[PDB]
């Protein structure tokens, strides 16, 4: 093929400046009550024989 | 209004308090508590207590 400039010159649509994140989750801050205080769907208290 | 502290540190706080504090709304707290005495009026005008 012969070469024709015009037709080979294309413009470019590119976004600009990301920052890609993996793992995710991590951003989650989470603690836990003290075991002696649990509950199931029940809501009364899992493990309740003092 | 009110919010039992005992049940708070038990339940795990639902940002209920977190929100009210953030948004500034008239509220109360309840239970055992450490008082702290001050003098030099100043402190007051400066409104330290907030």
Swiss-Prot record, chain A:
Sumoylated with SUMO1 and SUMO2. Sumoylation of viral proteins seems to have a positive role on viral replication. The record marks 9, 11 as: Interaction with the intermediate capsid protein VP6. It is found in: Virion. Belongs to the rotavirus VP2 family. Inner capsid protein that self-assembles to form an icosahedral capsid with a T=2 symmetry, which consists of 120 copies of VP2, with channels at each of its five-fold vertices. This capsid constitutes the innermost concentric layer of the viral mature particle. It encapsidates the polymerase VP1, the capping enzyme VP3 and the genomic dsRNA, thereby defining the core. Homodecamer; each decamer is made up of two conformers of VP2, called VP2A and VP2B. Interacts with a VP1-VP3 complex. Interacts with the intermediate capsid protein VP6. Interacts with NSP5. Interacts (via N-terminus) with NSP2. The N-terminus binds RNA. It is necessary for encapsidation of VP1 and VP3. The N-termini of 10 VP2 molecules form a cylindrical hub underneath each 5-fold axis of the inner capsid. This is Inner capsid protein VP2. The chain holds residues 831 to 880 of 880 of the full protein.
